[PDB]
Amino acid sequence: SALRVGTDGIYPPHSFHAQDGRGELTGFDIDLIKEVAHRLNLKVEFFETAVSGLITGLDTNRYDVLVNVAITPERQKKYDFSIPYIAHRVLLVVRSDQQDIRSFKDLTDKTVAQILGTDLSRFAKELKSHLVFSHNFEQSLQLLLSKRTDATMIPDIPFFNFLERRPHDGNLFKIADRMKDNSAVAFMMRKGNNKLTRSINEILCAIHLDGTYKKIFDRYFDKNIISSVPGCSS
């Protein structure tokens, strides 16, 4: 039988297409949930969904597992999470010549880009910027350098991914602040899916042990920069 998985499919390197959008669905999260499926003896079924419809696809039962979801207390209330399988940090990016903005605390009434997908709206309310949405990091960079924005807030994973893709890119921008603590990310299911949560959990543990979590991680992230999560025990 089939393990139905919803995703946006446009968040490199979590869930993206091989290039210009025309190659297969791939990414760290994808290979991992595929691995999980293989180990539950299931053929995985992907449901690419617009960012706005990702949770409501769960609620609606278009699919059963949702990829690349940050744990929030109110999500733990209403849904089931797996054990965390990766984490990220928010970075604050600005123009190289920017001097008035040096911290998350400097963003008050400044206009600040967030790339859709990155789920940063709630963290950004507190902050208390006037917030705009960009399609990808390149788009935001065009806004940043032209001054249509005062900053972009982006999670590190995608940031550093951009830097590996385009690694001789001007030094036209910089990191002005970095989230000290980091934020756990996991698979999300409807509340009640409990047989399903413990298996995922169980497989994720067995994936860590036998060396596959590492394999898959190194395929996509630099271990030196990007935070992993913990291992397991036999």
Place this chain on the structure above:
Amino acid sequence: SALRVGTDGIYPPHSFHAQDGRGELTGFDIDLIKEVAHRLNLKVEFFETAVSGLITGLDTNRYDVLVNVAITPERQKKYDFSIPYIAHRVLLVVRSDQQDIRSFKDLTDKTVAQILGTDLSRFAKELKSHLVFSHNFEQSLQLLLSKRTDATMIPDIPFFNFLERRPHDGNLFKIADRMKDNSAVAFMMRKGNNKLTRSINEILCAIHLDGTYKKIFDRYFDKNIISSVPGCSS
């Protein structure tokens, strides 16, 4: 209304009594589970039991929550775990003069000190060592120093805490080897305690988000040597 917790209080810094064994139960896992407890408005009830019957004590409803449990696939099958809250690293410790123990695979035909009824103790039996049963890590370490054993498999948290409390023993032990990954630790519960698990996980999430986690961790660890788990998202 009461939240019942299993533990043996002879495991500094996890679980011990103040004033050299004469006072209140305290420790990192203690102070966290109470925090958790106060946030679900529960008075907390401690039941102390030798590690050997901790897990069976949870089978037989002597208490509801076990603290400081390393997640294994086997236990994931038969029990509910919380989100991880800490990580540990499984060290092979020897006397600093010892020359013929360079890996876990050299424990075969060596006298090893492990705690009765633990997985590390199972591991020693499997590696076909001469086992010596200790009643905690302090004794595992004392025995190593008295030459009544030649090694012990011990996680980093209680090992480094011994070294904090007795710094002149610093140079008498050495780490011969480590498991190449660290290992997640969580609260363990009987399968089907799903609303409880959702509640603990929610509260832990808040405990990270307000900086209490950090307060509790820094009370007992050097974040430079002990791995924390990822934080949450608002």
